[PDB]
Design a protein around this ligand. Sequence first.
Ligand SMILES: CCCCCCCCCCCCCC(=O)OC[C@H](COP(=O)(O)OCC(O)COP(=O)(O)OC[C@@H](COC(=O)CCCCCCCCCCCCC)OC(=O)CCCCCCCCCCCCC)OC(=O)CCCCCCCCCCCCC
Ligand SMILES: CCCCCCCCCCCCCC(=O)OC[C@H](COP(=O)(O)OCC(O)COP(=O)(O)OC[C@@H](COC(=O)CCCCCCCCCCCCC)OC(=O)CCCCCCCCCCCCC)OC(=O)CCCCCCCCCCCCC
Ligand code: BCL
Ligand code: BCL
Ligand SMILES: CC[C@H]1c2cc3[nH]c4c(c3C)C(=O)[C@H](C(=O)OC)c4c3nc(cc4[nH]c(cc(n2)[C@@H]1C)c(C(C)=O)c4C)[C@@H](C)[C@@H]3CCC(=O)OC/C=C(\C)CCC[C@H](C)CCC[C@H](C)CCCC(C)C
Ligand SMILES: CC[C@H]1c2cc3[nH]c4c(c3C)C(=O)[C@H](C(=O)OC)c4c3nc(cc4[nH]c(cc(n2)[C@@H]1C)c(C(C)=O)c4C)[C@@H](C)[C@@H]3CCC(=O)OC/C=C(\C)CCC[C@H](C)CCC[C@H](C)CCCC(C)C
Ligand SMILES: CC(C)=CCC/C(C)=C/CC/C(C)=C/CC/C(C)=C/CC/C(C)=C/CC/C(C)=C/CC/C(C)=C/CC/C(C)=C/CC1=C(C)C(=O)c2ccccc2C1=O
Ligand SMILES: CC(C)=CCC/C(C)=C\CC/C(C)=C/CC/C(C)=C\CC/C(C)=C\CC/C(C)=C\CC/C(C)=C/CC/C(C)=C/CC1=C(C)C(=O)c2ccccc2C1=O
Ligand SMILES: COC(C)(C)C/C=C/C(C)=C/C=C/C(C)=C/C=C/C(C)=C/C=C\C=C(C)\C=C\C=C(C)\C=C\C=C(C)\C=C\CC(C)(C)OC
Ligand SMILES: CCCCCCCCCCCCO[C@@H]1O[C@H](CO)[C@@H](O[C@H]2O[C@H](CO)[C@@H](O)[C@H](O)[C@H]2O)[C@H](O)[C@H]1O
Ligand SMILES: [Fe+3]
Lengths: 60, 298, 335, 69, 56, 55, 101, 38, 271
Amino acid sequence: MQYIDGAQIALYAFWLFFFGLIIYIRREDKREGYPLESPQGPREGWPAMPEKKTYIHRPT
Amino acid sequence: TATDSVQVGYRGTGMEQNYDHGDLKKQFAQVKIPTPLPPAGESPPGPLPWQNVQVLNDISVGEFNRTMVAMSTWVAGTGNCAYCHNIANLAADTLPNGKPLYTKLVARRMLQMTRQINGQYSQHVKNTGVTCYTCHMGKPLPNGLWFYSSQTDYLRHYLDRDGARVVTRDVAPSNANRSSVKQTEWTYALMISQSRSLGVNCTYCHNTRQFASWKEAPPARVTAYHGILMLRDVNQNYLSPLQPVYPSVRLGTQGDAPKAQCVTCHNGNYKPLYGAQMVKDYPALWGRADWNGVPFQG
Amino acid sequence: MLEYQNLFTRVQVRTVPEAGIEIDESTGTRYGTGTFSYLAGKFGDAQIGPIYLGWAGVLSLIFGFMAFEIIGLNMWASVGWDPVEFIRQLPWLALEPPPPQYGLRVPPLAQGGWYLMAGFFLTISILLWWVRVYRRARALNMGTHLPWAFASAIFLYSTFFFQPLLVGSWSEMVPFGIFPHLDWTSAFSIRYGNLYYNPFHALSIAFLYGSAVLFAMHGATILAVARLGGEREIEQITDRGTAAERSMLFWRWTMGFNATMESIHRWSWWFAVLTTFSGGIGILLTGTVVDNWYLWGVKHGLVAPYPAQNTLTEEQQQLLRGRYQGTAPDSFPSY
Amino acid sequence: HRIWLMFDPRRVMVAMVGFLAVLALVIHFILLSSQRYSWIENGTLSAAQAPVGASAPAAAAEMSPLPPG
Amino acid sequence: HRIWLMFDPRRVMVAMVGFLAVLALVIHFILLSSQRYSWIENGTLSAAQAPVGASA
Amino acid sequence: HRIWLMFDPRRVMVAMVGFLAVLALVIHFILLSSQRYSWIENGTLSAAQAPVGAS
Amino acid sequence: PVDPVTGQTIINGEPVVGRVFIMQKTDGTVKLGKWQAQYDGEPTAPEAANVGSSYTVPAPEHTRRMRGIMIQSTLWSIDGKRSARERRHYRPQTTGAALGQ
Amino acid sequence: MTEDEARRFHGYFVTGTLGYIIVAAVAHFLAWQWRPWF
Amino acid sequence: AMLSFEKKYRVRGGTLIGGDLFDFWFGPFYVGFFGVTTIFFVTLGTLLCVWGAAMGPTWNLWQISIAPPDLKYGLGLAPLREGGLWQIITLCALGAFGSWALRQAEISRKLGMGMHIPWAYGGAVLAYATLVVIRPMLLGAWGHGFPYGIFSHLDWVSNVGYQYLHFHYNPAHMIAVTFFFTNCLALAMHGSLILSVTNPKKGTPVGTSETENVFFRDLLGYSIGAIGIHRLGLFLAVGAAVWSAICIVISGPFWTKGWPEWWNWWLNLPI
Ligand SMILES: CCCCCCCCCCCCCC(=O)OC[C@H](COP(=O)(O)OCC(O)COP(=O)(O)OC[C@@H](COC(=O)CCCCCCCCCCCCC)OC(=O)CCCCCCCCCCCCC)OC(=O)CCCCCCCCCCCCC
Ligand SMILES: CCCCCCCCCCCCCC(=O)OC[C@H](COP(=O)(O)OCC(O)COP(=O)(O)OC[C@@H](COC(=O)CCCCCCCCCCCCC)OC(=O)CCCCCCCCCCCCC)OC(=O)CCCCCCCCCCCCC
Ligand code: BCL
Ligand code: BCL
Ligand SMILES: CC[C@H]1c2cc3[nH]c4c(c3C)C(=O)[C@H](C(=O)OC)c4c3nc(cc4[nH]c(cc(n2)[C@@H]1C)c(C(C)=O)c4C)[C@@H](C)[C@@H]3CCC(=O)OC/C=C(\C)CCC[C@H](C)CCC[C@H](C)CCCC(C)C
Ligand SMILES: CC[C@H]1c2cc3[nH]c4c(c3C)C(=O)[C@H](C(=O)OC)c4c3nc(cc4[nH]c(cc(n2)[C@@H]1C)c(C(C)=O)c4C)[C@@H](C)[C@@H]3CCC(=O)OC/C=C(\C)CCC[C@H](C)CCC[C@H](C)CCCC(C)C
Ligand SMILES: CC(C)=CCC/C(C)=C/CC/C(C)=C/CC/C(C)=C/CC/C(C)=C/CC/C(C)=C/CC/C(C)=C/CC/C(C)=C/CC1=C(C)C(=O)c2ccccc2C1=O
Ligand SMILES: CC(C)=CCC/C(C)=C\CC/C(C)=C/CC/C(C)=C\CC/C(C)=C\CC/C(C)=C\CC/C(C)=C/CC/C(C)=C/CC1=C(C)C(=O)c2ccccc2C1=O
Ligand SMILES: COC(C)(C)C/C=C/C(C)=C/C=C/C(C)=C/C=C/C(C)=C/C=C\C=C(C)\C=C\C=C(C)\C=C\C=C(C)\C=C\CC(C)(C)OC
Ligand SMILES: CCCCCCCCCCCCO[C@@H]1O[C@H](CO)[C@@H](O[C@H]2O[C@H](CO)[C@@H](O)[C@H](O)[C@H]2O)[C@H](O)[C@H]1O
Ligand SMILES: [Fe+3]
């Protein structure tokens, strides 16, 4: 329509993608040193803890 | 080194003019205005004793000689009738051998040109007109003389080109404006030349956040536009038609008459001669019936 | 007097040059054996080792050198073949795009044909170099992260071809020249109404500044824990030591949140890639969707108000209207 | 003479030569950039013909070196 | 004086020389940039001809 | 003398040659850039015809 | 309105104690509205470009070698070398038959 | 260190300072005669 | 809360100002004397910014603009409503940035790390101080600073750039732009290299430190070290800010003409 234009639509698509990306990178930021130590118990911020990741090592 | 800054826009916008103090002082000091001639306002009520005079017809006799002394000191030098006349016959348009006096013919056409500038283009030279001294500065050849070079020379904007706008007046593209980035570069070059001709920067006539806006720009921009129109008249109807009068050493490589630009009057200053007023005391050069309420005798 | 800042290395250790991990050499091979530079070894590694060359690399070199030769020879011809003027005026010389009136049709050779040839060859060599980067990555069983970051760079580069095609003229392309390509940058911003108000231009500026911020932070952090073995990030990722722990705790105590030794490189990768991706989007949107970014900003409430600096009368508004720029005069009139 | 046991004469001589050379270059270039002592161009003038800075000056009318604010 | 047992003479001497040099250069340059004491250009003027600031 | 004990003659001579060459080049170029002493263009003029700083 | 006896400002029929001033935001600024309203008070739209119907090829001596758009204001306005100025345009040409050779 | 060289250094530093100050006084008096600032 | 390994590192000592009073943690944040000072300056500056927004004609986030004073008040504290508020906010920002750097120095002195991070942040602080303190002082008015507004400071940048006709021709601006572009390129390369080694082709083991050097030697013929890439990134990122400060401080205080004309010296070389 008139107020909506392509630049605005593309900008909001980029905002959505950027927020999803920030969520993914914050998920990766908690792969080491979690869950947190608190008197109330284990703590996980948003986004929650990811699944355990293991690497591959060459045989001896 | 101290820098003299003049604020030309709203605070915080970045619209300022910077000047180096030392060179500004040296440049201002070196200007030397000729002293105004003492007025001559007691001529007798007699007819004009002039044989060949087609411009200075509405002027008295004593003020006529006053104007002649002023013209000599502004263009050729104090006294020095030999640059435009022969001493023997001041009414003669030709040399004793037979060759026409081209300097005198040019001076006549340029008396007409100065009157036209002062009268018809007040929107540029408001209350501060021009004399012969503004362009000539005591020399026969002024500054900023230009000739035909090539098609894309931006100085043609002051002769026969028209139109420099490139910015769209809409949010969306259409066929109303199809300006190229190259045309924008041409306008950029012309405006850089204008800025250097007045010794100012882009913010003197622009809020560069939108170059097309006139309401966000200082009033000088309006004045500048009139300076374009005046030039287009001067270069088209007064300087160029003088092609057949000049000797070949005066013309360009295409054999065309010299033309004027902004730096011809301004010489790198925001106002010619820093805004010196000189023509208010020389009514023969006025194009009006009054300059500042001071009436014109006639 | 001062603590060792890990800025320069005082004692270099030499050994036999490293030939390299065994890789397939059916289409290309390594050239050189590996020399050592002492000055280079002060700041980083010292080995100017062998370089691999294969199909894509050789083809990329040939096409890129052809583009470079075309550009240089046109620059040299523009000064009348004067070597002194060639060197003196080098930053001002350019290979210029075609005239605007040809649109997308092929231009004359001396008026933009060379420009299109050089651009085509440069594009082909850049794509072949992308293929070479991908193959060098996959020959060592590495992931293809570098190919897809180079792809973002190539996307921004290719918008300088696609936007002139979308607006419909090869004249809008970037000239090959040191100063003239800066001239094009300025004129592009001016023509489309203050590219500062392009939201994707602002986005890409944010990502460029953020790349500088992130690299300063990461470099300072790793240099600050290099005394603990922090520069060996692979082992700190697969076996987290005290250097990684201290790096995490510094930033957690500083700004309240932190990354890991591995995910800080994800942050860096995405900031650098987004710099060119959002910029390419912004360029593609200019002149096709939006022709005046300042007016788009006014429409979407981006522009701060200032007091009017001038007011125009009714006759002034008619008089001050100008004319859109047209063609240059092809005659020298006599008056 | 005990000052030299306090500062290494090598360091002092290096600093002294450097400072004195920089000062000489700066003074020569300040004089060369002036109007009265631009000796390469106007050094043949007599002391009476040499430029002198302006004394206490007078004012001007409707003439400003600076554009209006 | 006991101040030399409280302050290293080398440090104090170096700091004093540096501060004095910077101060002297600053004062000389301030005078050179002024109108009344621009001695390189107007040093031959007498005390009556030297410029004086206005009463503004 | 005894300066060569306090300063290495090799280092001093290299520094002196470099400084002298730079100073000579700077002086020659300053003179070449001037109006009175642009000897390549006006070197054939007599001392009465050479340009003088205006005053 | 001002009370003609006490010289007091009256607002909606009530006098005010004090010196009444009209409130305004910082330096009299007003929020912008529609983009089409940016041209209220600005000059009307510029006229259509002047485009030559036909084109005449100039002489080589009147043609620039350098095709950069901003070369006249960025370099030539500050460059004044004689040979460099000479190399700015193409040279005049003729034919062997016209030269009688 | 032995508190005697402290006295000796104090004498040397004091006489150097005094001479520097008096030479500055002569310079200021000369400048005052040439062009007074008050 | 605390990380799994955090507890053993939270000890006493390493502060520059204060003792056991300011040696605690508020949530994840460490609070010192400079943490308290940072909070004070941040709160005062932000509240004054909100007041400047309230005084202005709009609450729109993009259009809010707190402008510096007129040039006629040169180096004096202007009236609050005519640009003095901008000056007070500038003082608050200077205090807050200095406190942030000193608090970072305290934190690094407590974990046994080097002092690199505060000095790296000092480059950005120096660039800001050049923009609002050094350059306005050399030019002689506080009104030479930039306004505090998301898009109005872009307008200031545009107008200041066009004050020198063509700001691209500033040589120091060209060097700083090169530093920024090279920094972005190097950051992309380093992130890609580390990620590709620790996340290799699926099915293959995690690569070693020799793989990085071998890859970059195969591609470019030279591979900087693991420490070398971090040194280069620090140098590039900080040099970009330093050369930015140089480029802005020479425009006006030292050069007042158009920047293109500055290249006369190159065209007038005797050769
Ligand atoms: C020249 C022109 C181009 C110009 C511009 C160019 C821009 C390029 C952008 C590239 C983005 C990815 C960058 C990257 O990391 O690349 C490395 C990787 C190569 O890795 P490798 O060599 O295979 O190495 C293997 C392994 O080491 C990879 O591990 P690494 O850590 O590197 O990657 C982690 C993987 C993990 O994947 C998963 O967990 C699976 C699920 C991933 C998400 C799938 C859905 C995504 C959205 C779909 C709709 C997306 C719609 C937009 O993760 C990644 O590689 C990426 C992680 C996510 C990144 C952020 C996503 C945010 C999404 C927000 C959405 C909005 C929410 C409101 O390259 C890849 O292509 C990986 C993916 C390969 C599988 C194919 C995926 C696409 C299949 C469908 C299309 C098929 C072809 C037509
Ligand atoms: C952008 C993304 C956002 C994102 C926002 C959302 C996410 C936020 C995430 C933040 C990090 C993770 C969460 C976390 O751990 O937070 C720390 C804390 C738990 O701390 P802790 O683990 O128990 O550790 C505390 C420990 O250090 C013990 O501290 P203690 O309790 O002894 O006292 C420390 C402080 C506070 O002192 C008190 O007396 C507290 C109670 C009174 C507070 C007010 C006192 C002032 C007078 C009244 C003012 C108020 C009168 C009305 O003592 C200090 O010395 C520390 C503070 C600094 C002191 C120096 C500065 C003085 C001048 C300050 C001037 C400005 C402040 C007034 O957690 C909580 O409080 C949980 C709830 C979340 C709190 C933040 C909520 C913010 C809502 C914002 C809404 C609007 C958003 C736009
Ligand atoms: C007056 C000038 C205008 C302006 C006009 C433009 C224009 C026009 C553009 C930018 C763009 C950008 N501008 Mg700018 N910009 C201005 C003001 C600024 C300011 C500022 C402080 O004022 C900043 C920080 C920036 C910053 C930025 C960047 C974020 C962005 C470019 C990223 C980039 O180039 O990566 C560097 C990466 C690349 C160039 C990608 C291509 C690299 C290729 C692949 C390399 C090939 C090399 C080849 C093989 C080498 C050999 C060649 C030989 C000849 C053989 N702009 C003002 C408003 N700006 C761009 C953008 O994205 O805008 C949305 C853009 O096009
Ligand atoms: C018409 C306009 C001109 C122009 C005129 C100018 C002007 C004018 C300037 C620059 C400057 C710069 N220009 Mg330029 N420039 C133009 C075109 C370009 C183009 C391009 C065409 O692509 C590019 C790449 C650039 C590039 C650049 C950079 C070299 C530099 C900006 C970075 C910088 O200073 O960082 C330095 C970093 C900082 C100043 C930031 C410091 C941050 C502080 C410490 C605060 C952080 C905390 C904050 C308050 C709060 C955080 C809160 C939490 C989030 C909760 N310019 C055009 C041609 N350019 C600028 C410069 O050099 O500045 C020094 C500058 O002023
Ligand atoms: C995330 C975005 C950033 C980025 C990323 C990026 N660029 C990349 C990569 C990545 C991830 C690569 O993998 C790739 C690479 O290999 O980097 C080392 C590349 C690359 N980025 C490059 C440059 C580059 N990147 C830039 C920008 C950026 N790249 C962004 C900031 C820019 C800018 C700012 O404009 C430039 C100029 C290249 C170094 C490289 C791609 C190389 C390529 O495609 O080469 C093709 C080959 C040729 C053109 C051959 C040319 C030959 C010579 C240049 C000419 C002949 C010389 C002659 C032999 C001698 C000299 C002359 C004689 C007369 C003396
Ligand atoms: C080497 C120089 C580069 C760099 C590096 C760098 N930045 C750094 C660091 C480093 C090494 C940090 O460690 C430090 C940090 O802790 O990051 C998480 C920081 C940091 N770089 C930041 C931002 C930043 N850096 C920038 C630039 C750069 N930083 C350079 C390119 C920019 C640009 C270009 O604009 C920005 C916006 C912060 C995220 C952070 C510093 C945090 C800080 O100082 O916090 C204290 C202040 C607050 C919490 C709030 C503000 C308090 C003020 C009183 C409010 C008033 C502000 C004022 C009105 C300005 C408004 C400006 C308008 C234009 C909007
Ligand atoms: C010798 C030689 C060659 C030298 C050449 C060098 C040259 C020429 C340089 C230029 C010289 C000139 C003229 C430049 C000027 C430089 C200046 C002005 C120097 C400043 C000196 C300096 C060290 C900077 C800042 C000083 C500091 C760090 C101050 C801190 C003082 C202190 C410890 C007290 C704490 C109180 C503070 C900091 C106030 C803020 C504050 C306040 C005000 C509260 O009310 C409050 C209440 C409750 C909680 C917190 C706070 C709080 O944080
Ligand atoms: C008391 C006191 C103040 C003292 C402290 C010291 C002071 C004063 C502070 C610092 C000031 C100083 C000394 C600064 C001067 C620094 C100097 C001398 C200059 C250095 C200049 C320099 C090193 C080069 C210039 C850089 C330029 C212009 C171009 C860069 C080009 C470029 C892209 C290079 C990258 C090189 C390559 C091939 C890298 C790829 C590469 C990457 C990207 C990896 O991630 C990686 C990881 C692990 C293994 C291999 C690699 C690897 O090699
Ligand atoms: C010794 O001297 C010689 C001559 C032998 C060698 C010297 C060479 C020298 C000195 C060379 C100097 C080169 C310089 C200084 C180059 C400067 C380059 C710069 C600064 C370039 C900057 C930007 C240019 C850009 C972004 C150009 C982009 C171009 C594109 C995307 C073009 C694409 C074109 C295509 C795809 C064309 C396709 C062909 C079609 C399909 C249209 O065919 C009809
Ligand atoms: C092509 C020309 C050459 C281009 C390359 C030039 C390389 C050298 C310039 C980049 C490095 C300059 O080196 C610079 O040194 C100064 C000292 O002057 C350091 O110090 C500077 O910043 C710090 C940071 O707070 C301030 O405290 C300090 O007062 C300031 O001088 C900088 O942190 C460092 O970046
Ligand atoms: Fe790293």
